[PDB]
Ligand binder design. Structure first.
Ligand SMILES: [Zn+2]
Lengths: 365, 141, 127
């Protein structure tokens, strides 16, 4: 029947093709990797990152490549994302898959249908093509490959997020007003509230509201979810599962194990919101009916809070960037604010590749 | 091609001017060769043994290997007799060298390699020359 | 071309395991079908590819590939780097060639001083 050798072969070949594609990409615009890698650096500390000079000059060896706009970088990153998905799949199936009389036997049946007048140049060409730059238009209109021809970022990012530049928190300011049952809270004071979650202890010991309040816990859930999805949305290239598991293990091994310690009050517990003299009473409190109840009711919330914490930490640069944006827009006039909005809009509804872009304008060094 | 023309002419003129010339006759080692299916000539030219090249090492065409060209005797400083070709071999400091080729054609092969295009100087040089730069031995056949 | 492809890949499949079944087939049948076995027939080259590839599949049979996302990325970056390097070598070469053309064009081919009158590929290497 089907000779597995051929199948495994085609698999290794396709894997090669994909690696070559995302490598060509990483070649034309090194930022694609650089960007990614930098973020990775602050999640998995061990990661080795390139020389700063390379990053800045946007070069990999000698040639400094043209700087690309954000929308395109992100696009290609999501494309490479699906590529890596394909690759992972093929690698999987492959792992699950890995005489003379028969030679003439098959060579005889190969004589079948001799009159098959047709040119066959479509195995490596249809694949190579299936994964290359500009595979959609007639010649050069759309950077997206035929593989991901229906990939659209605007269905993943809103206009106010600007493909990861900012995160839209106005909505959450609304919900928040609804939560505090007043209006004493401004967008900026709300952001001031969010800042608490950059600290390892503030969001825990100086809470905006009582952490056992319903409205509050619900809000926090929604917000947390948003921040996380935004995080992975803005950094396709990093292994999502890796990050998730890292955080989960940090949660189990440290956070819920008296990770918060004070020289005065001892050990704080996220679930019971109480301190403890020594580690001894702390341990014999983790079996008590109280802590069982709480850890059994408020588990999801505590975990979500924690995620909001660490994901907001990983996004400190975006948080700051947005807060800045807020203050700017706020200090605008009417005409100014209008023109700025115009700009965000144009950036939002613009082709990721312009008919007037450069290809092969490399400088040296 | 205009700018490239002026520029090229320039570089060639300058380079033609600063050409060092000690006019020292090197030592050639001609030898009748044969392979298959005809007969070809092979020359073994030896160069200095780090004797005088110790004073000039400023990457000025130092990377450039010796060059060969086939010249017709129709043009000479004396213009007396003529009618045969010479396989001239040249290197910046050392003096030029020639080898008379009465036979109309020898070793003039037919697509030896598989048509790869790095013209270097010409089909002749890439096709049939070797420059042992580590030992300073130029072979030509 | 499906026929040619299929026979190349099949004789390549068998040729990848024994190399003796084809050398026997050639003498047994006597068909102008396997004319690609000789390095003369152009397609032969691509053949040398396929076999190699199959030979490769025989390499890690019984071994799984456990490359992670991080790693795959790092790898593609390093490949990129390589390509850039190679590109640079090509550039340098072009430059040197240019120099040569200049000097060749710029020396006196009339400064004659003759004396007398009248395989290198494996030689242009090192061993
Ligand atoms: Zn507790």
């Amino acid at each position: 029947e089907m000779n597995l050798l051929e199948t495994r072969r085609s698999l290794l070949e396709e894997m090669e093709i994909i690696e070559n594609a995302i490598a060509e990409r990483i070649q034309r615009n090194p930022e694609l990797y650089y960007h990614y890698i930098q973020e990775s650096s602050k999640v998995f500390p061990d990661t080795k990152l390139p020389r700063s000079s390379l990053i800045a000059e946007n070069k990999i060896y000698k040639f400094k490549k043209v700087k690309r706009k954000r929308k395109q970088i992100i696009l290609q990153q999501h494309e490479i994302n699906i590529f890596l998905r394909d690759y992972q799949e093929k690698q999987q199936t492959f792992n699950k898959i890995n005489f003379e009389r028969k030679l003439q036997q098959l060579e005889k049946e190969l004589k079948n249908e001799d009159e098959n007048f047709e040119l066959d140049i479509n195995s490596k060409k249809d694949k190579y093509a299936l994964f290359s730059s500009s595979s959609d238009p007639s010649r050069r209109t759309n950077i997206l490959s035929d593989r991901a021809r229906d990939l659209d970022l605007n269905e993943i990012f809103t206009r106010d997020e600007q493909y990861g530049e900012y995160m839209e928190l106005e909505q959450f300011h609304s919900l928040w007003l609804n939560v505090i049952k007043r209006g004493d809270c401004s967008l900026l004071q709300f952001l001031d509230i969010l800042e608490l979650f950059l600290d390892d202890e503030k969001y825990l010991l100086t809470p905006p509201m009582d952490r056992k309040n319903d409205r509050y816990m619900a809000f926090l859930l929604k917000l947390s979810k948003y921040v996380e999805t935004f995080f992975f949305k803005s950094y396709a290239l990093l292994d999502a599962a890796a990050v998730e598991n890292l955080i989960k293990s940090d949660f189990e091994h440290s956070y819920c194990r008296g990770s918060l310690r004070s020289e005065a009050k001892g050990i704080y517990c996220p679930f019971c919101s109480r301190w403890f003299k020594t580690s001894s009473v702390f341990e014999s409190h983790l079996v008590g009916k109280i802590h069982k109840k709480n850890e059994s009711k408020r588990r999801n919330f505590v975990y979500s809070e924690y995620k909001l914490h660490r994901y907001l930490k990983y996004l400190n640069d975006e948080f700051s960037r947005t807060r800045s944006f807020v203050e700017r827009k706020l200090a605008f006039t009417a005409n100014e604010r209008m023109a700025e909005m115009d700009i965000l809009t144009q950036k939002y509804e613009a082709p990721a590749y312009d008919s007037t872009e450069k290809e092969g304008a490399e400088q040296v060094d | 091609x205009x700018x490239x023309x002026x520029x090229x002419x320039x570089x060639x003129x300058x380079x033609x001017x600063x050409x060092x010339x000690x006019x020292x006759x090197x030592x050639x080692x001609x030898x009748x060769x044969x392979x298959x299916g005809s007969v070809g000539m092979a020359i073994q030219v030896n160069y200095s043994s780090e004797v005088k090249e110790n004073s000039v090492d400023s990457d000025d065409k130092a990377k450039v290997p010796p060059l060969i060209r086939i010249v017709s005797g129709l043009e000479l400083s004396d213009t007396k007799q003529k009618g045969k070709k010479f396989l001239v071999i040249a290197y910046e400091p050392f003096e030029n060298i020639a080898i008379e080729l009465p036979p109309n054609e020898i070793l003039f092969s037919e697509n030896n390699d598989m048509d790869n295009n790095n013209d270097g100087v010409d089909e002749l040089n890439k096709k049939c020359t070797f420059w042992d730069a580590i030992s300073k031995l130029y072979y030509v056949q | 071309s499906r026929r040619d492809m299929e026979v190349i890949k099949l004789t390549a499949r068998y040729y990848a395991k024994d190399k003796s079944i084809v050398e026997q087939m050639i003498s047994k049948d006597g068909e102008a079908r396997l004319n690609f076995m000789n390095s003369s027939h152009p397609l032969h080259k691509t053949f040398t590819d396929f076999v190699a590839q199959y030979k490769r599949v025989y390499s890690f049979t019984g071994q799984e590939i456990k490359k992670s996302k991080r790693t795959i990325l790092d790898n593609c970056f390093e490949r990129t780097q390589y390509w850039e390097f190679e590109k640079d070598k090509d550039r340098e070469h072009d430059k040197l060639v240019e120099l040569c053309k200049i000097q060749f064009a710029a020396i006196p081919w009339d400064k004659f001083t003759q004396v007398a009158k009248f395989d290198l590929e494996q030689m242009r290497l090192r061993r």
